[PDB]
Amino acid sequence: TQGPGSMAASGNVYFDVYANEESLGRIVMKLEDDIVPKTAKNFRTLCERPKGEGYKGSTFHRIIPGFMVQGGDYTAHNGTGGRSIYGEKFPDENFELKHTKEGILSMANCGAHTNGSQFFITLGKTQWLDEKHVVFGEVVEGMDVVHKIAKYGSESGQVKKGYRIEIRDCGVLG
């Protein structure tokens, strides 16, 4: 029996990731709204907003094989920018979730209580980040697309010359 099914997964968000004009595929993330509601809200909202006001059309600007891939700087594209939906830096909501495995979605920051819009996805267990970065979700489809992203990085985090690794579209399923 053939045909598409309706949506099970509501609230899950996705990134369609591109290396220049080549599709790398889709990453789908589950957010832990019950555990970190404001952190989850910030990220989901930034997925739904238009280009220039959220993640749509932004890049993975720091890509470190064996460690993590980082994006969310949709204003400066270099790690110095980004803005949360609250208008500025927001507190670490809690550290209940831990960096236990590959595919963990966590907030980038520049110290205690400095959450904006930058995030990373881990390429392994990174226990040294526990209690320093707020974990708010995980990759549930397209972990292999995260490993593809890593092919375009380096020890230093610099992205391969000639490449922009872009979140070409993003949103909420539903």
Side-chain angles (χ1 to χ4, degrees), residues 1-6 8-50 52-82 84-131 133-154 156-160 162-174:
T1 295
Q2 305 206 313
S6 73
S10 100
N12 290 4
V13 299
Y14 68 92
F15 292 162
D16 295 332
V17 186
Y18 279 69
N20 292 161
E21 295 307 287
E22 188 63 16
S23 174
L24 298 184
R26 177 167 285 184
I27 303 160
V28 178
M29 287 149 289
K30 177 163 195 335
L31 314 179
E32 293 290 345
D33 296 78
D34 288 329
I35 302 171
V36 278
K38 300 301 196 181
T39 304
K41 172 180 192 180
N42 180 56
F43 189 82
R44 188 175 294 108
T45 307
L46 288 176
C47 292
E48 295 177 292
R49 278 181 180 176
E53 293 285 355
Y55 298 143
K56 189 168 173 158
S58 71
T59 71
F60 286 87
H61 73 269
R62 178 182 175 235
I63 306 179
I64 303 186
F67 174 35
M68 60 82 237
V69 306
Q70 181 180 333
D73 181 350
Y74 64 89
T75 63
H77 312 291
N78 63 16
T80 63
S84 78
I85 65 165
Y86 313 121
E88 61 214 307
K89 300 187 290 197
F90 69 98
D92 297 318
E93 177 165 38
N94 62 57
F95 302 112
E96 181 164 334
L97 301 162
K98 266 43 161 153
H99 302 78
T100 56
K101 62 180 183 298
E102 83 179 358
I104 295 293
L105 182 59
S106 179
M107 296 297 286
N109 63 44
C110 50
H113 302 309
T114 59
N115 298 293
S117 63
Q118 293 186 58
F119 63 87
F120 59 101
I121 303 177
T122 60
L123 293 168
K125 184 175 180 186
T126 57
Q127 64 276 7
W128 61 96
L129 305 182
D130 296 340
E131 303 177 305
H133 300 268
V134 176
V135 175
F136 65 99
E138 65 186 284
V139 171
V140 293
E141 314 173 42
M143 184 64 210
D144 68 313
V145 174
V146 185
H147 291 285
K148 292 176 212 182
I149 293 173
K151 290 279 164 165
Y152 297 88
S154 54
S156 72
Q158 295 183 35
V159 170
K160 197 172 177 56
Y163 284 89
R164 166 179 281 247
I165 307 295
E166 188 182 321
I167 298 181
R168 176 62 53 75
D169 196 18
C170 56
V172 166
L173 304 178

PDB file of all heavy atoms in Angstrom, residues 89-93 95 107-116 131-134, unseen atoms left out:
ATOM      1  N   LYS A  89      21.477  38.604  25.928  1.00  0.00           N
ATOM      2  CA  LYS A  89      22.011  37.418  26.580  1.00  0.00           C
ATOM      3  C   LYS A  89      21.058  36.976  27.657  1.00  0.00           C
ATOM      4  O   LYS A  89      20.522  37.813  28.369  1.00  0.00           O
ATOM      5  CB  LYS A  89      23.389  37.704  27.189  1.00  0.00           C
ATOM      6  CG  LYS A  89      24.456  38.152  26.174  1.00  0.00           C
ATOM      7  CD  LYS A  89      25.854  38.253  26.793  1.00  0.00           C
ATOM      8  CE  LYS A  89      25.990  39.406  27.778  1.00  0.00           C
ATOM      9  NZ  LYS A  89      27.442  39.768  28.089  1.00  0.00           N
ATOM     10  N   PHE A  90      20.816  35.680  27.733  1.00  0.00           N
ATOM     11  CA  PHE A  90      19.917  35.132  28.720  1.00  0.00           C
ATOM     12  C   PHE A  90      20.633  34.108  29.598  1.00  0.00           C
ATOM     13  O   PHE A  90      21.668  33.573  29.187  1.00  0.00           O
ATOM     14  CB  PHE A  90      18.567  34.659  28.100  1.00  0.00           C
ATOM     15  CG  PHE A  90      18.639  33.429  27.196  1.00  0.00           C
ATOM     16  CD1 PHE A  90      18.309  32.158  27.695  1.00  0.00           C
ATOM     17  CD2 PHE A  90      18.946  33.550  25.844  1.00  0.00           C
ATOM     18  CE1 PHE A  90      18.340  31.017  26.856  1.00  0.00           C
ATOM     19  CE2 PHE A  90      18.987  32.432  24.986  1.00  0.00           C
ATOM     20  CZ  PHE A  90      18.686  31.160  25.478  1.00  0.00           C
ATOM     21  N   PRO A  91      20.111  33.879  30.823  1.00  0.00           N
ATOM     22  CA  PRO A  91      20.758  32.997  31.773  1.00  0.00           C
ATOM     23  C   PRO A  91      20.829  31.563  31.350  1.00  0.00           C
ATOM     24  O   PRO A  91      20.006  31.116  30.571  1.00  0.00           O
ATOM     25  CB  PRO A  91      19.858  33.100  33.022  1.00  0.00           C
ATOM     26  CG  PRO A  91      19.334  34.509  32.926  1.00  0.00           C
ATOM     27  CD  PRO A  91      19.087  34.728  31.484  1.00  0.00           C
ATOM     28  N   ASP A  92      21.778  30.829  31.941  1.00  0.00           N
ATOM     29  CA  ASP A  92      21.809  29.382  31.841  1.00  0.00           C
ATOM     30  C   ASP A  92      20.593  28.844  32.584  1.00  0.00           C
ATOM     31  O   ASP A  92      20.487  29.017  33.793  1.00  0.00           O
ATOM     32  CB  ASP A  92      23.128  28.846  32.420  1.00  0.00           C
ATOM     33  CG  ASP A  92      24.330  29.341  31.640  1.00  0.00           C
ATOM     34  OD1 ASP A  92      24.217  29.342  30.379  1.00  0.00           O
ATOM     35  OD2 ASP A  92      25.330  29.808  32.273  1.00  0.00           O
ATOM     36  N   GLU A  93      19.650  28.223  31.869  1.00  0.00           N
ATOM     37  CA  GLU A  93      18.373  27.857  32.469  1.00  0.00           C
ATOM     38  C   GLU A  93      18.514  26.750  33.535  1.00  0.00           C
ATOM     39  O   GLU A  93      17.987  26.870  34.652  1.00  0.00           O
ATOM     40  CB  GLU A  93      17.403  27.537  31.333  1.00  0.00           C
ATOM     41  CG  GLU A  93      16.043  27.057  31.680  1.00  0.00           C
ATOM     42  CD  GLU A  93      15.096  27.151  30.439  1.00  0.00           C
ATOM     43  OE1 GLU A  93      15.572  26.869  29.304  1.00  0.00           O
ATOM     44  OE2 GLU A  93      13.918  27.569  30.595  1.00  0.00           O
ATOM     45  N   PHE A  95      21.437  22.948  34.104  1.00  0.00           N
ATOM     46  CA  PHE A  95      22.390  21.996  33.519  1.00  0.00           C
ATOM     47  C   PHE A  95      21.960  20.571  33.835  1.00  0.00           C
ATOM     48  O   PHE A  95      22.785  19.705  34.118  1.00  0.00           O
ATOM     49  CB  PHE A  95      23.835  22.242  33.996  1.00  0.00           C
ATOM     50  CG  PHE A  95      24.359  23.618  33.705  1.00  0.00           C
ATOM     51  CD1 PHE A  95      24.620  24.501  34.723  1.00  0.00           C
ATOM     52  CD2 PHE A  95      24.642  24.000  32.404  1.00  0.00           C
ATOM     53  CE1 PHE A  95      25.121  25.768  34.459  1.00  0.00           C
ATOM     54  CE2 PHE A  95      25.154  25.262  32.106  1.00  0.00           C
ATOM     55  CZ  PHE A  95      25.379  26.158  33.128  1.00  0.00           C
ATOM     56  N   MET A 107      23.996  24.971  23.798  1.00  0.00           N
ATOM     57  CA  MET A 107      24.273  26.384  23.571  1.00  0.00           C
ATOM     58  C   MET A 107      25.761  26.735  23.636  1.00  0.00           C
ATOM     59  O   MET A 107      26.457  26.393  24.600  1.00  0.00           O
ATOM     60  CB  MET A 107      23.471  27.284  24.576  1.00  0.00           C
ATOM     61  CG  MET A 107      22.000  27.195  24.405  1.00  0.00           C
ATOM     62  SD  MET A 107      21.506  27.783  22.799  1.00  0.00           S
ATOM     63  CE  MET A 107      21.707  29.545  23.014  1.00  0.00           C
ATOM     64  N   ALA A 108      26.239  27.441  22.594  1.00  0.00           N
ATOM     65  CA  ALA A 108      27.524  28.119  22.630  1.00  0.00           C
ATOM     66  C   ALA A 108      27.350  29.396  23.488  1.00  0.00           C
ATOM     67  O   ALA A 108      26.257  29.931  23.622  1.00  0.00           O
ATOM     68  CB  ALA A 108      28.039  28.445  21.157  1.00  0.00           C
ATOM     69  N   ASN A 109      28.417  29.882  24.094  1.00  0.00           N
ATOM     70  CA  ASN A 109      28.304  31.047  24.935  1.00  0.00           C
ATOM     71  C   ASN A 109      29.698  31.588  25.109  1.00  0.00           C
ATOM     72  O   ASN A 109      30.658  31.059  24.535  1.00  0.00           O
ATOM     73  CB  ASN A 109      27.638  30.694  26.317  1.00  0.00           C
ATOM     74  CG  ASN A 109      28.475  29.723  27.135  1.00  0.00           C
ATOM     75  OD1 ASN A 109      29.705  29.898  27.211  1.00  0.00           O
ATOM     76  ND2 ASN A 109      27.838  28.663  27.731  1.00  0.00           N
ATOM     77  N   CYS A 110      29.819  32.661  25.831  1.00  0.00           N
ATOM     78  CA  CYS A 110      31.160  33.176  26.109  1.00  0.00           C
ATOM     79  C   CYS A 110      31.303  33.364  27.593  1.00  0.00           C
ATOM     80  O   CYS A 110      31.864  34.359  28.031  1.00  0.00           O
ATOM     81  CB  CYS A 110      31.414  34.493  25.339  1.00  0.00           C
ATOM     82  SG  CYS A 110      30.064  35.702  25.567  1.00  0.00           S
ATOM     83  N   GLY A 111      30.793  32.396  28.377  1.00  0.00           N
ATOM     84  CA  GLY A 111      30.840  32.473  29.851  1.00  0.00           C
ATOM     85  C   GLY A 111      29.453  32.275  30.449  1.00  0.00           C
ATOM     86  O   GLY A 111      28.442  32.162  29.702  1.00  0.00           O
ATOM     87  N   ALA A 112      29.406  32.219  31.786  1.00  0.00           N
ATOM     88  CA  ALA A 112      28.137  32.071  32.497  1.00  0.00           C
ATOM     89  C   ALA A 112      27.126  33.109  32.000  1.00  0.00           C
ATOM     90  O   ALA A 112      27.427  34.318  31.836  1.00  0.00           O
ATOM     91  CB  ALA A 112      28.309  32.198  34.051  1.00  0.00           C
ATOM     92  N   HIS A 113      25.917  32.624  31.775  1.00  0.00           N
ATOM     93  CA  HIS A 113      24.766  33.458  31.534  1.00  0.00           C
ATOM     94  C   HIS A 113      24.951  34.366  30.354  1.00  0.00           C
ATOM     95  O   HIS A 113      24.621  35.544  30.436  1.00  0.00           O
ATOM     96  CB  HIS A 113      24.408  34.276  32.800  1.00  0.00           C
ATOM     97  CG  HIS A 113      24.129  33.425  34.000  1.00  0.00           C
ATOM     98  ND1 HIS A 113      23.239  32.380  33.967  1.00  0.00           N
ATOM     99  CD2 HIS A 113      24.606  33.470  35.271  1.00  0.00           C
ATOM    100  CE1 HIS A 113      23.186  31.800  35.155  1.00  0.00           C
ATOM    101  NE2 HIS A 113      23.997  32.451  35.974  1.00  0.00           N
ATOM    102  N   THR A 114      25.482  33.810  29.260  1.00  0.00           N
ATOM    103  CA  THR A 114      25.656  34.565  28.024  1.00  0.00           C
ATOM    104  C   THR A 114      25.057  33.946  26.782  1.00  0.00           C
ATOM    105  O   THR A 114      25.566  34.167  25.688  1.00  0.00           O
ATOM    106  CB  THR A 114      27.126  34.831  27.734  1.00  0.00           C
ATOM    107  OG1 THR A 114      27.837  33.580  27.631  1.00  0.00           O
ATOM    108  CG2 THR A 114      27.724  35.769  28.837  1.00  0.00           C
ATOM    109  N   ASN A 115      23.986  33.180  26.944  1.00  0.00           N
ATOM    110  CA  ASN A 115      23.280  32.565  25.816  1.00  0.00           C
ATOM    111  C   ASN A 115      22.690  33.586  24.837  1.00  0.00           C
ATOM    112  O   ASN A 115      22.045  34.576  25.259  1.00  0.00           O
ATOM    113  CB  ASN A 115      22.158  31.691  26.361  1.00  0.00           C
ATOM    114  CG  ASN A 115      22.695  30.550  27.235  1.00  0.00           C
ATOM    115  OD1 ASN A 115      23.376  29.630  26.745  1.00  0.00           O
ATOM    116  ND2 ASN A 115      22.416  30.611  28.519  1.00  0.00           N
ATOM    117  N   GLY A 116      22.950  33.377  23.547  1.00  0.00           N
ATOM    118  CA  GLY A 116      22.375  34.275  22.498  1.00  0.00           C
ATOM    119  C   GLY A 116      21.608  33.410  21.513  1.00  0.00           C
ATOM    120  O   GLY A 116      20.506  32.894  21.840  1.00  0.00           O
ATOM    121  N   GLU A 131      27.884  21.474  32.637  1.00  0.00           N
ATOM    122  CA  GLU A 131      27.814  22.597  33.591  1.00  0.00           C
ATOM    123  C   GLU A 131      28.424  23.906  33.105  1.00  0.00           C
ATOM    124  O   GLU A 131      28.468  24.888  33.866  1.00  0.00           O
ATOM    125  CB  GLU A 131      28.423  22.197  34.956  1.00  0.00           C
ATOM    126  CG  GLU A 131      27.729  21.000  35.523  1.00  0.00           C
ATOM    127  CD  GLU A 131      28.327  20.524  36.832  1.00  0.00           C
ATOM    128  OE1 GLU A 131      29.546  20.263  36.899  1.00  0.00           O
ATOM    129  OE2 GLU A 131      27.569  20.406  37.798  1.00  0.00           O
ATOM    130  N   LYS A 132      28.881  23.924  31.853  1.00  0.00           N
ATOM    131  CA  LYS A 132      29.361  25.118  31.195  1.00  0.00           C
ATOM    132  C   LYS A 132      28.474  25.546  30.018  1.00  0.00           C
ATOM    133  O   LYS A 132      28.396  26.746  29.761  1.00  0.00           O
ATOM    134  CB  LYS A 132      30.813  24.949  30.685  1.00  0.00           C
ATOM    135  N   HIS A 133      27.823  24.590  29.343  1.00  0.00           N
ATOM    136  CA  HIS A 133      26.951  24.853  28.216  1.00  0.00           C
ATOM    137  C   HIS A 133      25.623  24.164  28.455  1.00  0.00           C
ATOM    138  O   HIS A 133      25.605  22.975  28.820  1.00  0.00           O
ATOM    139  CB  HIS A 133      27.616  24.344  26.906  1.00  0.00           C
ATOM    140  CG  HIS A 133      28.928  25.010  26.646  1.00  0.00           C
ATOM    141  ND1 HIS A 133      29.026  26.152  25.890  1.00  0.00           N
ATOM    142  CD2 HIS A 133      30.159  24.802  27.183  1.00  0.00           C
ATOM    143  CE1 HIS A 133      30.280  26.585  25.915  1.00  0.00           C
ATOM    144  NE2 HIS A 133      30.988  25.784  26.686  1.00  0.00           N
ATOM    145  N   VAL A 134      24.527  24.885  28.197  1.00  0.00           N
ATOM    146  CA  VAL A 134      23.190  24.334  28.387  1.00  0.00           C
ATOM    147  C   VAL A 134      22.786  23.405  27.236  1.00  0.00           C
ATOM    148  O   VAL A 134      22.619  23.835  26.096  1.00  0.00           O
ATOM    149  CB  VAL A 134      22.093  25.407  28.581  1.00  0.00           C
ATOM    150  CG1 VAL A 134      20.668  24.762  28.687  1.00  0.00           C
ATOM    151  CG2 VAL A 134      22.377  26.274  29.774  1.00  0.00           C
TER     152      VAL A 134
END
